[PDB]
A = this chain, B = another copy of it.
């Protein structure tokens, strides 16, 4: 059960939970100003492509935010 497209997978799945490089809950919450909460109802896990596709978005939007309002060099 992938949190972001709803599909079910073998180990085509990455954990979001720790008890630093990169941390999904925080990175999601920062970029889109919206948190990701823990029920038994919900899975601890997101699929390889959905996690890949998230950080490809994170990278390019960080790059937009560095540049949008600064004069070229």
Contact = CB atoms under 8 A, between A and B. Distances in A.
Interface of A: 1, 3-7, 28, 31-34, 36-37, 39, 41-42, 50, 53-54, 57, 60-61, 63-65, 67-73
Q: How many copies does the complex hold?
A: 2
A69 B37 contact: yes
Contacts of A65: 32, 34
Contacts of A36: 68-69
8 contacts: A3-B68, A4-B63, A32-B65, A34-B68, A34-B69, A42-B70, A53-B60, A57-B57
A67 B3 contact: yes
A68 B57 CA distance: 16
